[PDB]
Structure 1
Amino acid sequence: STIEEQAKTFLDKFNHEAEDLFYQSSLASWNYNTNITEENVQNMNNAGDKWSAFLKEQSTLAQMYPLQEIQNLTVKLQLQALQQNGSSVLSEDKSKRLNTILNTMSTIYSTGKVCNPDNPQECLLLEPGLNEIMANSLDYNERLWAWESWRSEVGKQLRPLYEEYVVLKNEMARANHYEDYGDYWRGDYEVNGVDGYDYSRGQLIEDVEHTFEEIKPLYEHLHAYVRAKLMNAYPSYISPIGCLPAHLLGDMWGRFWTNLYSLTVPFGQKPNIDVTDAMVDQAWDAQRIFKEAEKFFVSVGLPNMTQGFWENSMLTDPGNVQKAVCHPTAWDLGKGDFRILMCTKVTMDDFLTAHHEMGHIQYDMAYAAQPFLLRNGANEGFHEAVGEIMSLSAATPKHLKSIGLLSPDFQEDNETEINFLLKQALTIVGTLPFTYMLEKWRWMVFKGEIPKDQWMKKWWEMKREIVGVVEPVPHDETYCDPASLFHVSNDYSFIRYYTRTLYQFQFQEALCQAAKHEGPLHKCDISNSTEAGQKLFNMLRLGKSEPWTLALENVVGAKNMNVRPLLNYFEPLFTWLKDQNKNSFVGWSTDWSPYA
Structure 2
Amino acid sequence: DEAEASKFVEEYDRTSQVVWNEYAGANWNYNTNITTETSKILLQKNMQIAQHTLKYGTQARKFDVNQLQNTTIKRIIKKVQDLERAALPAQELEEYNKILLDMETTYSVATVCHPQGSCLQLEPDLTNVMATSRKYEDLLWAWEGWRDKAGRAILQFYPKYVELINQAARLNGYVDAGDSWRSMYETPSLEQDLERLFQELQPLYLNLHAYVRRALHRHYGAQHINLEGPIPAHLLGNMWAQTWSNIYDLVVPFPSAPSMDTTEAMLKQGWTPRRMFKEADDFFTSLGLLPVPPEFWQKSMLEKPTDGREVVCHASAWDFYNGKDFRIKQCTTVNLEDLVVAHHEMGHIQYFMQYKDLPVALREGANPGFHEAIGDVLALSVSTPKHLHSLNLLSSSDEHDINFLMKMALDKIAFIPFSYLVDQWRWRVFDGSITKENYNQEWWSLRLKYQGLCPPVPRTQGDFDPGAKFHIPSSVPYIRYFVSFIIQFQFHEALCQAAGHTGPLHKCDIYQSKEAGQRLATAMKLGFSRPWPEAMQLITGQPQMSASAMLSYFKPLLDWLRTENELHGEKLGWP
Bin for the TM-score computed over the shorter chain:
0.7 to 0.9
Deviation at 1:277, TM superposition (A): 8.7
How is 1:341-420 mapped onto 2 (pairs within 5 angstroms)?
A: 341=328, 352=340, 355-399=343-387, 413-420=397-404
Deviations 1:266-311 (A, max 9, x none): 3344333577898899999988877776564455343x64875477
Asked whether the equivalents of residues 147 and 247 of structure 1 are also in contact (C-alpha less than 8 Å), the reply is yes
Amino acid at match of 2:371: H
Which deviates more from structure 2 when the two are superposed, residues 146-155 or residues 321-330? 321-330
Amino acid at match of 1:219: Y
* Partner residue, 1:217: 203
Asked if 1:333 is matched to 2:320, the reply is yes
Q: Structure 1 CA distance, aligned partners of 2:419 and 2:292?
A: 38
* Partner residue, 1:583: 568
Asked whether the equivalents of residues 501 and 508 of structure 2 are also in contact (C-alpha less than 8 Å), the reply is yes
Asked if 1:546 is matched to 2:542, the reply is no
Asked whether the equivalents of residues 130 and 234 of structure 2 are also in contact (C-alpha less than 8 Å), the reply is yes
How is 1:61-460 mapped onto 2 (pairs within 5 angstroms)?
A: 61-110=59-108, 112=110, 119=115, 124-152=120-148, 155-156=151-152, 158-159=154-155, 161-190=157-186, 199-200=187-188, 203-236=189-222, 237-272=224-259, 296-297=283-284, 299-302=286-289, 305=291, 308-309=294-295, 313=299, 330-341=317-328, 352=340, 355-399=343-387, 413-450=397-434, 452-460=436-444
Q: Structure 2 CA distance, aligned partners of 1:589 and 1:280?
A: 40
Cα pair distance change 1:364/1:93, threshold 3 Å: closer
Deviations 1:535-585 (A, max 9, x none): 222212111111112221111232223211111112222222223221232
How is 1:556-575 mapped onto 2 (pairs within 5 angstroms)?
A: 556-575=540-559
Q: Structure 2 CA distance, aligned partners of 1:91 and 1:43?
A: 20
* Partner residue, 1:193: none
Cα pair distance change 1:474/1:16, threshold 3 Å: closer
Cα pair distance change 1:398/1:134, threshold 3 Å: closer
Asked whether the equivalents of residues 434 and 442 of structure 2 are also in contact (C-alpha less than 8 Å), the reply is no
Deviations 1:313-342 (A, max 9, x none): 569899996989787555433433144456
Which deviates more from structure 2 when the two are superposed, residues 496-505 or residues 337-346? 337-346
Q: Structure 2 CA distance, aligned partners of 1:486 and 1:44?
A: 20
Deviation at 1:525, TM superposition (A): 2.0
Cα pair distance change 1:129/1:389, threshold 3 Å: closer
Amino acid at match of 2:378: M
Asked whether the equivalents of residues 330 and 338 of structure 1 are also in contact (C-alpha less than 8 Å), the reply is no
Deviation at 1:78, TM superposition (A): 0.9
Asked whether the equivalents of residues 110 and 149 of structure 2 are also in contact (C-alpha less than 8 Å), the reply is yes
Asked whether the equivalents of residues 246 and 469 of structure 1 are also in contact (C-alpha less than 8 Å), the reply is yes
Asked whether the equivalents of residues 59 and 82 of structure 1 are also in contact (C-alpha less than 8 Å), the reply is yes
Which deviates more from structure 2 when the two are superposed, residues 223-232 or residues 103-112? 103-112
Q: Structure 2 CA distance, aligned partners of 1:397 and 1:569?
A: 15
Amino acid at match of 2:259: N
Amino acid at match of 2:175: E
Q: Structure 2 CA distance, aligned partners of 1:440 and 1:138?
A: 31
Asked whether the equivalents of residues 317 and 348 of structure 2 are also in contact (C-alpha less than 8 Å), the reply is yes
Amino acid at match of 1:8: S
Deviation at 1:510, TM superposition (A): 1.0
Partner SS for 1:527: coil
Amino acid at match of 2:136: Y
Deviations 1:105-152 (A, max 9, x none): 444444646555xx4787655455555443422222333344444444
Q: Structure 2 CA distance, aligned partners of 1:143 and 1:288?
A: 32
* Partner residue, 2:464: 480
Q: Which runs of 5+ in 2 are unaligned?
A: none
Which deviates more from structure 2 when the two are superposed, residues 254-263 or residues 160-169? 160-169
Asked whether the equivalents of residues 435 and 494 of structure 1 are also in contact (C-alpha less than 8 Å), the reply is yes
Q: Which has the higher helix share?
A: 2
Partner SS for 1:250: coil
Which deviates more from structure 2 when the two are superposed, residues 276-285 or residues 266-275? 276-285
Amino acid at match of 1:459: W
Q: Structure 1 CA distance, aligned partners of 2:269 and 2:143?
A: 44
Q: Which runs of 5+ in 1 are unaligned?
A: 191-198, 591-596
How high is the TM-score relative to the length of structure 1? 0.82
Deviations 1:225-244 (A, max 9, x none): 11111111011221222232
Q: Please, which of 489, 494, 502 is the counterpart of residue 473 of structure 2?
A: 489
Which deviates more from structure 2 when the two are superposed, residues 211-220 or residues 58-67? 58-67
Asked whether the equivalents of residues 233 and 456 of structure 2 are also in contact (C-alpha less than 8 Å), the reply is yes
Deviation at 1:93, TM superposition (A): 4.5
Q: Structure 2 CA distance, aligned partners of 1:260 and 1:414?
A: 21
Count residues with an aligned counterpart: 571
Asked whether the equivalents of residues 494 and 539 of structure 2 are also in contact (C-alpha less than 8 Å), the reply is yes
Amino acid at match of 1:233: H
Q: Structure 1 CA distance, aligned partners of 2:38 and 2:384?
A: 42
Deviation at 1:156, TM superposition (A): 4.6
Asked whether the equivalents of residues 35 and 322 of structure 1 are also in contact (C-alpha less than 8 Å), the reply is no
Which deviates more from structure 2 when the two are superposed, residues 387-396 or residues 37-46? 37-46
Asked whether the equivalents of residues 330 and 361 of structure 1 are also in contact (C-alpha less than 8 Å), the reply is yes
Asked whether the equivalents of residues 170 and 446 of structure 1 are also in contact (C-alpha less than 8 Å), the reply is yes
Q: Structure 2 CA distance, aligned partners of 1:37 and 1:97?
A: 19
Which deviates more from structure 2 when the two are superposed, residues 65-74 or residues 287-296? 287-296
Cα pair distance change 1:378/1:490, threshold 3 Å: same
Which deviates more from structure 2 when the two are superposed, residues 67-76 or residues 271-280? 271-280
Deviations 1:68-112 (A, max 9, x none): 311212111211221123234444444444344434444444464
Cα pair distance change 1:231/1:563, threshold 3 Å: same
Q: Structure 2 CA distance, aligned partners of 1:98 and 1:284?
A: 42
Amino acid at match of 1:554: L
> For the pair shown, which has the larger CA radius of gyration, 1 or 2?
1
Asked whether the equivalents of residues 316 and 345 of structure 1 are also in contact (C-alpha less than 8 Å), the reply is no
Asked whether the equivalents of residues 36 and 322 of structure 1 are also in contact (C-alpha less than 8 Å), the reply is no
Deviation at 1:521, TM superposition (A): 1.0
Cα pair distance change 1:255/1:62, threshold 3 Å: same
Partner SS for 1:187: helix
Asked whether the equivalents of residues 340 and 379 of structure 2 are also in contact (C-alpha less than 8 Å), the reply is yes
Deviations 1:17-76 (A, max 9, x none): 333444455566667878999998888777676455444423333332332311212111
Give the CA RMSD over aligned residues.
3.9
Cα pair distance change 1:307/1:395, threshold 3 Å: same
* Partner residue, 1:195: none
Q: Structure 1 CA distance, aligned partners of 2:135 and 2:221?
A: 11
Which deviates more from structure 2 when the two are superposed, residues 377-386 or residues 17-26? 17-26
Amino acid at match of 2:535: A
Asked whether the equivalents of residues 152 and 467 of structure 2 are also in contact (C-alpha less than 8 Å), the reply is no
Amino acid at match of 1:10: F
Q: Structure 2 CA distance, aligned partners of 1:282 and 1:97?
A: 50
Amino acid at match of 1:210: R
Asked whether the equivalents of residues 315 and 344 of structure 1 are also in contact (C-alpha less than 8 Å), the reply is no
Amino acid at match of 1:264: V
Which deviates more from structure 2 when the two are superposed, residues 263-272 or residues 26-35? 26-35
Partner SS for 1:553: helix
Q: Structure 1 CA distance, aligned partners of 2:167 and 2:274?
A: 52
Partner SS for 2:232: coil
